[model samples]
Target chain A: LISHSDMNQQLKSAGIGFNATELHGFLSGLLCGGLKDQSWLPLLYQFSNDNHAYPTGLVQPVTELYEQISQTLSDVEGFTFELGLTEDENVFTQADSLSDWANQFLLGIGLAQPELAKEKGEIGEAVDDLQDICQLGYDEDDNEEELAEALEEIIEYVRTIAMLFYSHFN
Target chain B: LISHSDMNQQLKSAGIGFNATELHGFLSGLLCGGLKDQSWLPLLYQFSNDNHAYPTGLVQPVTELYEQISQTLSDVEGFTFELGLTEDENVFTQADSLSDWANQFLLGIGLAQPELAKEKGEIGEAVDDLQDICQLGYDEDDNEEELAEALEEIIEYVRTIAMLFYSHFN
Candidate 1:
């Protein structure tokens, strides 16, 4: 969705069917249950020397990936904080709360977290299973399979990325 | 030599001098001593990794170094809250009276610990008279010639520095 505070005539009409507290409660309930599971975070610190966990930016790669993707497509320039927060149709937000965001429209669009639905769907599936991968450590169990699958896909994607760079060199 | 604060200059010309109270008496004394013997410090901490012991704007392999150094420099900047304390002037300061700080300056320039200095340089001469280093551990008598040759230079330097860095200056 564009932003939490952003609203239009259509959104106002849609919001009228449910009161503010009810809409809020519905969204809140959706978080703790199925169809919209609580977003489990990557362990900030692991037992190993995964530098990804201790990024120099102090940012998780997944978070960075989300930011880069958002910036690339979104019209973020002239997006002042005060103006963005104002109740305007084209308003934008620099903040993102995992829950309580009024942007349910983002759930359908790949923009919220699972947008790679067009690429025969890789990112969407990965995000879908991310909660499981985070809970189950990689010990020949659920995590090991998820880990292997993710790494394999990542390797292929990175190889394609390297090939793109190689083309520039050539 | 002592901190003389706002004794009327015209009255002083008439030979009427006001005796100022001893505010930071121990520290003010060290400042005059640093001026007495030129200290080479602006060039030293350029290579230090310790956040508190290093200078600001000397970014390197440390990102936290910049944040740390900037915070440290901001504290130095805060000192300008009172009278004229310019960044260009590295005067002897009560801020250095912090035992940890004074010792760090000496440690960086290789003079904080007298025993450490004696081990590295020709310090055996003056120390030979003491005959206590061997009594302490290394079973060797005072070789007067070696001791004299070794001890004279650094002893003078250390004795001088031990004064400037630790004891009263003027």
Candidate 2:
């Protein structure tokens, strides 16, 4: 599994501001039901636009970042959405980060089509589930094993939703 | 010299939430040209008022706190405005704590009367000085003696401003 933390380290070392969690969410959204035409290019352009502190010598790295992301999204079904701590990631895999990931995924979907998630259907149900899940905060004193199992189940359902959208729309 | 650290200890034991830096700033503001009737009472009342988890038998120690503070303010000329750490108080005052004190003092005065410090002449000049002082952050590697001496001088000036306000208003 390619580590998002590795991506963060790489981006930071290159002095490029990036949030791996947001990128993960964006990719997940695209895999699920997001529009390719949804101005994601502008999001990439925010980092890549020339004349803004560019050395005027080196090509903007954000353009490369866009290509990398697009390539990753092209094979999104193979991806797993886990933002919590792993051996490669220093930040603890906590409910908060998971919530952030879900929220950002919703944001990507919303950016693609604001009304798409509101219509009655499987997409609406999935988006609504994501919304509710994004708001949850794990109980501090609760059993960690129970929370982990629950999170795994939720992720499985989210994967199914993404597959559904990919098959139906994409 | 009332030990702010001691006050913090007392408040903390009483299950009252208090920031030593903020209280220090409030006291410093009271010592430096702040009006009692100009809404400072409400700031105190916020803690002393009933129905807010305060111990019923304690008579809301905050009222006594108010008395102690107002009494201290009556002898405003005797007060000094050193907010950083003190061996006597057993609280190591840092630049951040001092900065918060100055900011809080400004906040207190603003609460009392926002326009009182904006007028032309000596009052304006003193207020401007406090504003400038509030922005200061001591360099971590700077000489402590030099910073202490500078802070002492600024406190002296703040003392005079309080006296000026007390005499003009009281």
Candidate 3:
């Protein structure tokens, strides 16, 4: 897997402004929502940079990341999937990345599965939880230690829910 | 984070006989056992290639991998660490890699902390479990589904125990 910084730089060099976290979430959402083919490529370009033109030197790495996420999500028995996020020590920064990931994931899945909003039961509840998580943020007054713990819990929940979504859709 | 196949090829080209899984386990063990400095380099070359001479072209990638493992292990709050193993579809092969990793980890931690055997309590218990996991293997008669499920449980346990060991020492 590419490091977040490296991936971010690659995207930047290719004139795409979005960070690695957003790309990962979008790719993951596409996979989990059953967009398992090369169709996500155009969507990624449009979603990230609002342009259909493919960036130079970006296809290989982005496709590699897409396959990596696909393999991980497909590993139902292993359950070794992980979110691609920063390794920053700052709790607030990490929270911001998680929020960005959730937001992008909602967008990607919504694009892939249009009827997602009308779905009921477990999937609907998971989507609801993810939507709420997209709005999560930390204030300056929040305790660092407490925020860290909460972030861990939420990340774990997100990982599990991602697998749940993948299983349900794919 | 280098892929296992790429890392394996690099090691092979440099005349290092060991695979990526062993290197990851060894580095992980060295870190978890509190060998957090550049001292692990010599031990790595000696342990893997059985030579004091540094293989040409092997230093950079291995060092990068070492730093990657260190960063992941140090991310206590994020808990985003993952084992470096093959993305093989075969469950038995994956189990074999897990066993090899456990065995290499034992060797690594033992080399770093010679008195590890003397430690009583949770650490000692974790060491014991890891040692047991090291000897794990599968038979042709075993069911694939059951083996996959068991492997998942063991992998999760190993991940948790690794964190436990890292916390205790570092």
Candidate 4:
């Protein structure tokens, strides 16, 4: 399994602007919205480096990571699916990564599924919920334990929603 | 977050009779079957050391572990639950740990839920499936890749069934 720090270093070395969490969110979104492998390849490059091609050295690792996320999401059993996010011990850092992930996921969905906005009922509601989660953050005065608990719940919800979208769209 | 090796060392130092995977299975079964904390204390001791009390040095660590498992299983949002098994690179060693886990889980469930046999329908079917899994093992001639894939599916199934039993019973 690729750790967040390791991926971050890879991205830094490659001079890619985005963090691992954001990339993960986008990849997950692409998978959830049923984008084909060929279709997502260009989008991955665009997302990583502003529509420019990936550095020759970076393409293989990113593709491998994408394939892994795809396999996990597409597994029939669905138990192994997990968000690519930081394992930071601090609640604030963890929450920040989650927010980034949620934001990128929405962006990925928009790129992959232009028709998503027209969908009503459960999908729409889930999208709205995700949008709200994308804005989640904490203040210095907030209770740490409470925030951690809430974040866990939100993370679990996001995971479930991601799978739901994948199952529905695919 | 104790690893299998660490817990094995602890058990050895304490002269307990069961491995960590078996202990995890029993703990999960106890949680799944809705055994009360007070009720499970004696069972834990019995399972670890043949009806004798835990060594004085081992009590605190085991109790803490029990509490951790209890919290993970009883969480309303169920995504954090995972079976405590070895992270061995060898598929066969992993499978052996899983088998031990399944076997001990059945024993734990029987101890905690005497009326389980009378329960018909989903619970009955799940228990039956678990019984089959408890006997799972790969022959020496089996393909390694195939066994790994099958084991992944079985682990997912076991996880889902454990959560189902926990939800239904408690």
Largest DockQ belongs to which candidate? Answer: 4
lDDT of 3 at B99: 85
User: At residue A152, what lDDT does model 2 achieve?
Assistant: 42
Ranking by TM-score: 4, 3, 2, 1
Q: Per-residue CA lDDT of candidate 4, range B5-88, in tens? A: 888888888778787888889988888888876878788778778888877756777777778877877863544568888888
Which number leads on lDDT?
Answer: 3
What is the DockQ for all candidates, taken in turn?
0.01, 0.01, 0.01, 0.02
lDDT per residue, candidate 2, B81-157, as tens digits? 23433333211254345556667677666656667755654455456656765665334343344334334434444
The collision pairs in model 2 are: A84-A93, A85-A93, B84-B93, B85-B92, B85-B93
Q: What is the alpha-carbon lDDT of model 4 when measured against the actual structure?
A: 0.75
Residue-by-residue lDDT tens digits, candidate 1, B50-129? 22332232222122322333232233322211111112222122211222232333333233233433431112221231
Off by over 4 Å in 1: A1-99, A102-106, A111-170, B1-44, B47-170
- Tens digits of per-residue lDDT, candidate 4, A2-118, equal 567888888888788688888889989998998876878778778778787777756777788888888888863544678988878777778788889999999998888998888
lDDT of 2 by residue, A72-100 (tens): 44443343223322232212255566666
Evaluate all candidate structures by whole-model CA lDDT and list the values in order: 0.25, 0.50, 0.76, 0.75
Candidate 4 docking: what grade?
A: incorrect
Candidate 3 per-residue lDDT, tens place, A1-170, comes to: 66788888888777775788998999899888989777797788787877665566677778888888889788734456789977788877887898889998888888889999987644665687788677764455443544564366457557766776787788
Tell me which residue pairs clash in candidate 4. Answer: none
lDDT of 1 at B1: 19
DockQ, structure candidate 2: 0.01
Please give the lDDT score at residue B134 for candidate 4: 68
